[PDB]
Each structure stands twice: as C-alpha cells, then as structure tokens.
Amino acid sequence: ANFLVHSSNNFGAILSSTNVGSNTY
Amino acid sequence: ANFLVHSSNNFGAILSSTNVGSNTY
Amino acid sequence: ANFLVHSSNNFGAILSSTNVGSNTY
Amino acid sequence: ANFLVHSSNNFGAILSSTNVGSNTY
Amino acid sequence: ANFLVHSSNNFGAILSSTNVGSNTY
Amino acid sequence: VHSSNNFGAILSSTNVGSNTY
Amino acid sequence: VHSSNNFGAILSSTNVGSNTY
Amino acid sequence: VHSSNNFGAILSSTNVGSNTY
Amino acid sequence: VHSSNNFGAILSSTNVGSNTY
Amino acid sequence: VHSSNNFGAILSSTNVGSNTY
Numbered sequence: 284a285n286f287l288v289h290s291s292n293n294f295g296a297i298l299s300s301t302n303v304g305s306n307t308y
Numbered sequence: 309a310n311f312l313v314h315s316s317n318n319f320g321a322i323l324s325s326t327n328v329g330s331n332t333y
Numbered sequence: 334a335n336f337l338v339h340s341s342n343n344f345g346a347i348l349s350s351t352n353v354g355s356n357t358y
Numbered sequence: 359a360n361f362l363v364h365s366s367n368n369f370g371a372i373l374s375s376t377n378v379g380s381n382t383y
Numbered sequence: 384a385n386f387l388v389h390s391s392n393n394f395g396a397i398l399s400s401t402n403v404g405s406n407t408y
Numbered sequence: 409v410h411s412s413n414n415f416g417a418i419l420s421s422t423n424v425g426s427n428t429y
Numbered sequence: 430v431h432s433s434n435n436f437g438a439i440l441s442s443t444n445v446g447s448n449t450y
Numbered sequence: 451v452h453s454s455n456n457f458g459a460i461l462s463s464t465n466v467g468s469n470t471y
Numbered sequence: 472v473h474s475s476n477n478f479g480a481i482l483s484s485t486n487v488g489s490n491t492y
Numbered sequence: 493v494h495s496s497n498n499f500g501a502i503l504s505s506t507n508v509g510s511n512t513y
Contacts (some may be wrong), residue, residue: 284309284384284385284400285309285310285311285385285386285387286310286311286324286332286385286386286387286388286399286400287310287311287312287387287388287389287403288311288312288313288388288389288390288397289312289313289314289321289389289390290313290314290316290318290390290391290393291315291316291317291390291391291392292316292317292333292391292392292393292394293315293317293318293322293390293393293394293395293478294317294318294319294320294323294394294395294456294458294477295319295320295321295322295346295388295394295395295437295456295457295458295459295479296318296321296322296325296395296396296397296398296459296469296479296500297313297322297323297324297393297395297396297397297398297456297502298321298322298323298326298391298394298397298398298401298459298480299309299311299324299325299386299394299397299399299400299401300311300324300325300326300399300400300401301324301325301326301328301397301398301400301402301482302326302327302328302402303317303328303331303401303403303404303405303461303462303482303483303503304309304327304328304329304403304404304405304406304462305319305328305329305330305332305354305405305441305462306321306331306332306406306407306408306441306442306443306462306463306464306483306485307331307332307404307405307406307407307408307474308331308333308408308422308443308464309334309340310334310335310336311336311349312335312336312337313336313337313338314337314338314339315338315339315341315343315347316340316342317341317342317455318340318342318343318346318347319342319343319344319345319435319437320342320343320344320345320346320347320371320416320435320436320437320438320458320459321346321347321395321437321438321458321479321480322338322346322347322348322349322350322458323335323346323347323348323349323438323459324336324349324350324460325334325336325349325350325351326348326349326350326351326353326452327351327352327354328353328354328440328441328442328461328462328482329353329354329358329405329441329462330353330354330355330356330357330379330441331350331356331357331420331421331422331441331442331443332356332357332422333356333357333358333422333443334359334383335360335361335378336359336361336364336374337359337360337361337362337416338361338362338363338366338381338410339362339364340363340364340366340368340372341365341366341368342367343365343367343368343371343372344367344368344369344370344414344416344435345367345368345369345370345371345372345414345415345416345437345438346371346416346417346437346438346458346459347371347372347373347374348371348372348373348374348376348438349361349374349375350359350373350374350375350376351374351375351419351440352376352377352378352379353374353378353379353419353420353440353441353443353461354378354379354420355368355378355379355380355381355382355420356360356379356381356382356420356421356422356441357381357382358382358383358422369414370416370417370440371416371417372438373417376419378419378420378440379420381420394477394479394498395458395477395478395479395480395500395501396479396480396500396501398480398501401482401503403482403483403503403504404483404504405462405483406462406463406464406483406484406485408443408464408485408505409430409431409449410431410432411431411432411433411434411436411447411449412431412432412433412434413432413433413435413436413447414435414436415435415436415439416436416437417438417439417440417450418436418438418439418440418442418445419438419440419441420440420441421439421440421441421442421443421445422442422443422444423443423444423445424439424442424444424445424446425445425446426432426446426447426448426467427446427447427448427450428432428447428448428449429448429449429450430451430452430470431452431453432451432452432453432454432455432468432470433452433453433454433455434453434454434455434456434457435456435457436456436457436460436463437458437459437463438455438459438460438461439457439459439460439461439463439464439466440459440461441461441462442460442461442462442463442464442466443462443463443464443465444464444465444466445460445465445466445467446466447467447468447469447488448467448468448469449453449468449469449470449471450469450470450471451472451473451486451491452473452474453473453474453476453489453491454473454474454475454476455474455475455476455478455489455492456477456478457477457478457489458478458479458480459480459481459482460478460480460481460487461480461482461483461492462482462483463481463482463484463485463487464484464485464486465484465485465486465487466481466484466486466487466488467487467488468474468488468489468490468492468509469488469489469490470474470489470490470491470492471490471491471492472493472494472512473494473495474494474495474496474497474510474512475494475495475496475497476495476496476497476498476499476510477498477499478498478499478502479499479500479501480501480502480503481499481501481502481503481505481508482501482503482504482505483503483508484502484503484504484505484506484508485505485507486506486507486508487505487507487508487509488508488509489495489503489509489510489511490509490510490511491495491510491511491512491513492511492512492513
C-alpha cells in the first residue's frame with residue numbers, strides 16, 4: 284500500500300483509503 | 309494499491325478507495 | 334489498482350473506487 | 359484498474375467504479 | 384504500508400489510511 | 409439577499425437543502 | 430447580505446444547508 | 451455582510467451550514 | 472463585515488457553521 | 493471588520509464556527 288498525491292491549489296481536503304463508519308438518524 | 313492525484317484548482321475534496329458505511333433514517 | 338486524476342477547475346469532489354453502503358428510510 | 363480524468367469546469371462531482379448500495383422506502 | 388504526499392498550496396487537510404468510526408444522532 | 413451554493417455529490421443521504429428566510 | 434458557500438461531497442449525511450435570516 | 455465559506459467533504463455528518471443574521 | 476472561512480473535511484461531525492450577526 | 497479563518501479537518505466534532513458581532 285503506497286500512497287502519494289500531487290495537487291496545486293485544491294480547495295478541499297484529500298483522503299487515502301478512508302473508511303470511517305456508518306451514520307444513523 | 310498505488311494512489312496519486314493531479315489537480316490544479318478543484319473546489320471539492322478528493323478521496324481514495326473510500327467506503328465509509330451505510331446511513332439510516 | 335492505480336489511481337490518478339487530472340482536473341483544472343472542478344466545482345465538485347472527485348472519488349475513487351467508492352462503495353459506501355446502503356440507505357434506508 | 360487504472361483511473362484518470364480530464365475536466366476543466368465541471369459543475370458536478372466525478373466518480374470512479376462506484377457501487378454504493380441500495381435504498382429502501 | 385508506505386505513505387508520501389506532494390502538495391503545493393492545498394487549502395484542506397490531508398489524511399492517510401484514516402478510519403475514525405461511526406456517528407449517531 | 410441570496411445564498412449561491414452548490415453540491416457535488418450527495419450519495420445516499422436523507423435531507424439536504426439551504427434554508428434562507 | 431449573502432452566504433456564497435459550496436459543498437464537494439456529503440456522502441451518507443442527514444441534514445445539510447446554510448441558514449441565513 | 452457576507453460569509454463566503456466552503457466545504458470539501460462532510461461524509462457521514464448530521465448538521466452542517468453557516469448561520470448569519 | 473464578513474467571515475471568509477473554509478473547511479477541508481468534517482467527516483462524521485454533528486454541527487458546523489460560522490455565526491455572524 | 494472581518495475574521496478570515498480556515499479549518500483543515502474537524503473529524504468527529506460537534507460544534508465549530510466563528511462568531512463575530
């Protein structure tokens with residue numbers, strides 16, 4: 284599992300192999 | 309699993325192999 | 334599994350091999 | 359599985375091999 | 384598991400293999 | 409007054425939309 | 430007055446939107 | 451007056467949005 | 472007056488947004 | 493007057509936002 288990124292002026296966050304969980308009401 | 313990106317002026321976030329979960333009402 | 338992107342001025346987020354889950358009412 | 363994109367001024371998000379799940383009423 | 388990044392002027396945070404948990408209402 | 413917002417992708421959500429009175 | 434916001438991706442959320450009165 | 455904010459990704463949240471009166 | 476803020480990622484939160492009166 | 497702030501990532505929080513009156 285090798286991760287790299289190349290961004291210049293992104294206005295959002297960047298993630299990597301993310302799996303946080305579920306959400307409930 | 310190798311990840312890279314190349315964006316200049318994105319106004320959103322970028323993700324990678326994301327699978328967070330389900331949502332319920 | 335190799336991922337790369339090339340966008341200039343996207344107004345939305347970008348995803349990669351995403352499969353989060355289901356939703357219920 | 360190799361992914362790349364090339365968009366200039368998209369007003370929507372972009373996805374890649376997405377299959378989230380089902381929805382129920 | 385090897386991680387590296389290359390960003391110039393990102394306006395968001397960057398993450399790596401993140402999976403925090405679920406959220407409930 | 410005005411809001412002027414946008415949304416990229418809201419997959420598998422349940423309630424979205426801007427309220428302005 | 431105005432808000433002028435945006436959203437990238439709000440996957441699997443339940444309530445999103447800016448309130449301005 | 452104005453707010454002028456933005457959001458990248460708000461995955462699996464429950465209440466987001468800027469209030470300005 | 473104005474706020475001019477931004478957010479990268481707010482994963483799995485419950486209440487976000489700037490109040491300015 | 494103005495605030496001009498920003499946020500990187502606020503994962504799993506409950507209340508964020510700058511108040512200026």
